[PDB]
Amino acid sequence: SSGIVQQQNNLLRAIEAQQHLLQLTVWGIKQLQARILSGGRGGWMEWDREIEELIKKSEELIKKIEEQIKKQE
Amino acid sequence: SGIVQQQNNLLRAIEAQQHLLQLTVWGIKQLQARILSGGRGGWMEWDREIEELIKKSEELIKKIEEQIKKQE
Amino acid sequence: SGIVQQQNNLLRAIEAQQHLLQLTVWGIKQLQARILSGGRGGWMEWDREIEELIKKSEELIKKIEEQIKKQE
């Protein structure tokens, strides 16, 4: 059960697990930031922006890989 | 070069990023402890969601590592 | 798509997550600097470990992209 195909499927599951972890850490940072520094001064506004754009980019790629794997005919 | 060696390197990247993640979690927990005493405000659930995904992620990485070895 | 095209997409996913990790480390550092004065309490080693792991994984990521292109 250790072929390349299988390993690629497992790497994907690891990638998605870590993706979920990243969103959890982002949630935590926002909670702390909101309590310390209400308002986005010092670059937190561009930070929010970059995060949201990279989260979308990442979940899109994951979706696409999940589609490639299923696409097997 | 080749699919096998590229996969091993992908695993190394993911493993390095796993260690980075666990460091960032440590950082957040330290800060949260200082600003707010306790696990009120959602932090209890957060701690538990985090540790669940961490072990799951760790298991998959060890699993792939094993598959790579069994193939040799 | 095949294994080759999948690896390429996996790499892109990993590089996106590398940039995410860089952004979260930035946020944690901003917070720590505002709350705490020095590098006491483990933040000194945290900084060093973080920077090492960040360099190591982006080294691996850049290497893989190049290895793959060298396969043509």
Author numbering:
A (entry chain A): 0 to 72
B (entry chain B), C (entry chain C): 1 to 72
Paper excerpt:
After the binding of the gp120 to the cellular receptors, gp41 undergoes conformation changes after fusion peptide (FP) inserts into the target cell membrane, exposing N-terminal heptad repeat (NHR) trimer, and forming the six-helix bundle (6-HB) structure. Peptides derived from the HIV-1 gp41 CHR are potent HIV fusion inhibitors, which specifically interact with the viral gp41 NHR to form heterogeneous 6-HB to prevent fusogenic gp41 core formation. Our previous studies have shown that AP1 and AP2, artificial peptides with non-native protein sequences, could form coiled-coil structure to interact with gp41 NHR and inhibit HIV-1 Env-mediated cell-cell fusion. To elucidate the molecular determinants of these artificial peptides, we successfully solved all three complex structures of AP1/AP2/AP3 peptides binding with gp41 NHR.
